[PDB]
Amino acid sequence: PTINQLVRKGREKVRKKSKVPALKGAPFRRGVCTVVRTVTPKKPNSALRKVAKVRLTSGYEVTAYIPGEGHNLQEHSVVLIRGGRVKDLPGVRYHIVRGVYDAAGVKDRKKSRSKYGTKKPK
């Protein structure tokens, strides 16, 4: 572009699209599970992954992943969630934070237990 054109139209500053829309600014956000089921993932994986349809405090509803092996999460379980998606499960854009509200820690977990909300063992 000529310099003149730049004086005229100027450069267009790029904008940023949040990948975590429902959070509405906040770091984490509280909610209740409406559905708790398993979803098969996209190719080339095969599994029955653990998810919850969750109703936010912003009166939103997101699909959120349940980490760990096994869970105490059910319909009507009050839960806390955090950002970050699960690439193989489209539409899952948030993770459940284990060890908060009616979300337990992973029983028998010994490695990297901060992530899985398990208190330090024997």
Partner: peptide, 10 residues
């Protein structure tokens, strides 16, 4: 946001 009877509403 009304659930089956949960005192939690959302």
């Amino acid at each position: 946001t009304v659930x089956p009877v949960x005192p939690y509403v959302x």
